């Protein structure tokens, strides 16, 4: 029965149950041979210090197991416990049931707690033994069927997390707390079922009354958000039900579509769109859409998948700065997705951001040859102006890569344009502090008698730098 | 002007890679502001938290001077 | 003598057999990488071996002599050990590589049994900078710079030798079926790669821990120096070749950010015994324990096996059923099974979208291999 087998070895040890400081385990006792009898009884002398004693048991060099706690004035400590718990955890069904009933025939403690508050009900839930669960639920109270462990996992949470279905049905028929939440995570059994991808458990859970699909958690994520981990079956099971908040938002405002897009996998997004209820233009707390995430992460295949055959608005901008997703593609050196976005019919290349920022200006700043080639090929205006009216030639001069302005020289860009200050680009080129970036303009024979609003001239610009 | 001016030095901290690691630190300081990142990690991987942090940092007004010296990108 | 030819044919045959039995796309890619990385530096080092040998006797200053002595001793130990290890048989190769206080152990921290190391002298010579040509000729400075270049190339060579040896050992022990030893060699390969990368390019080069950029800047400074230069035409060409080679090797090293796949899958969530099969069959016996492990099936990189699960006792039931959670990355997963302390066996493969995995297929294969009819 259990771990008791003929020819094995038994060792015992004792410890102080201290809740503040680390204790020490005594040296293991002498070997005890195992024979026809299995369950022993230990006579414990009364402790001199009047403390509770924890008992540890080991079998022939296996991993030791805690078997009980004894009060100072308790004698004849029977080791019948920790075997009923092991019997309920037996992967086999008939053997476990026989061991359970034999140990219960001889006075086994149902209420004993092992493995951080896990009772026999938790062990039966993890193993999925339906017979012992039915026998326990036949005569039981609701206070023990809903008893959480140290981590907050009630038996229904363990049953849902292990993928078992029959025991979940048994607890549903008997009646247990369904919307119970764990500690520090506040995860319902639906969250655990969705995070792993079990369909039968989800169906059994939804068969019960008094259950909401849209239950939140610590960070505001619904089970539909957790269904992203499940590939196709659990998401379809979610979409098959009656009342689902498909566009549910978390604390930050993220939607399940946002999670599917940011994870870079299309089939889940297609399955979610199959419900014909997903709002593509859903925004975040900073007015960020799924297309913005795709542009900022370079997911070009998903970008093509979502941009075509769909009614999507590609002109949505973030509220703080009115900065579009094509600006995201331009930034962080994402040339291919930006080039694809430019050729799209429903994408505006001339869109402006806060401060009069155009995509061409950021392309010039980032020094991307391919994007500027697309700018020339498409036919976008080269003389775009900002609120402070720095020309693209000005930004090319100010950029860390001078070799841009050279190919801007042959495009007909005016080199005498001035900003709010009446200073030519050569005047501003001396102020930035770059040496080699100014030689490629000096050879063009640019005038040297221009005055700005404050009166300075190019010789003053190099005086403060040292070019 | 003022002799005790570090405008050139301030341009260097926006271009030095070591000071770009300091720009990571302020990006790393957003973990206190928003505590929803770890749960996003278990669902959409590690890249989810990085993407949210990047969007939060880059959502505001863009500065030309900061972008010129190269500490706007990372 | 005929035995001299016979011994060399033994060495060549052993090398070919060693480079033939270990077949895997992982070693294919690793060997291609290491050969395209080493070829040029190995050839130039072989060409300049004799030049450094005549450099050794040209040093007379007592302050700098120990540095070149240490570098030469390490180089002699390294190439002598390579020559000794090249021609041995596969079994002898494994036994020599797998031994306490071996050549690999000395190579990891770059020391020798006769307490000779090069990394500390390499850092010390850069720290003070005797290589700068203060004098108009400064011949000893040129010799010191040449020794520094030799040491850097030898350090890169020993890095790549360690990488290829560890990869070969790991794949050999993975194909043999020893999961524990393959795991330990996997960890050693990852650790040595990380440490050598941090030693060459630095963790963001904030403190200039890497030595590649330091020697690059020293070469740039001596090139920019004009009065210190000796005006010789060949000096410019050789420093140009050194700059090109070091830039190429630095780009090659910085190109990769990882060597192997360190991601770890998730093991089974629940195990049961549903099929009615009494268990005097196969390896399933009463009183035995079974452990399971999972791995990513990768055709281009090296994966990692998950930690073995809790032991499961075998009583009256043989074939279990395992419930597998859906993979986050949607990758096929290899499953391994171990009985007690016996050698682990691969039992099958599981798809991302199928949960109930039954371990009954390998038992039939073992049943067909039973010596008893």
Numbering used by the authors:
A (entry chain B): 375 to 841
B (entry chain B): 21 to 94
C (entry chain A): 95 to 467
Study text:
The potent neurotoxic venom of the black widow spider contains a cocktail of seven phylum-specific latrotoxins (LTXs), but only one, α-LTX, targets vertebrates. This 130 kDa toxin binds to receptors at presynaptic nerve terminals and triggers a massive release of neurotransmitters. Each monomer is composed of an N-terminal four-helix connector domain (CD; residues E21–D115), a central helical bundle domain (HBD; residues S116–K350), a short β-sheet plug domain (PD; residues Q351–D453) and a C-terminal tail of 22 ARs (ARD; residues I454–G1195).
The architecture of each subunit of state 1 has a characteristic G-shape and is similar to that of the soluble α-LCT monomer and the δ-LIT dimer19. The tetramer in the prepore state is assembled by stronger interactions between the PD of one monomer and ARs 1–6 of the clockwise neighboring monomer and is further stabilized by weaker interactions between the HBDs and PDs of neighboring monomers. The prepore displays a high degree of conformational flexibility in the curvature and/or relative orientation of different subunits and domains, resulting in “breathing motions” of the central channel. Moreover, in the prepore state, the helices of the N-terminal CD are tightly packed and protected within a groove formed between the HBD and the ARD-tail, with helices α1–α3 being fragmented, but stabilized by a conserved disulfide bond. A stepwise assembly of the tetrameric prepore can easily be rationalized by the involved subunit interactions, which are almost exclusively formed between the PD of one monomer with the AR domain of the clockwise neighboring monomer. The tetrameric prepore is well resolved in this region and shows that the introduced VPRG residues are placed N-terminal of the last β-sheet (β7) of the PD domain, disturbing the crucial intermolecular oligomerization site between PD and neighboring ARD.
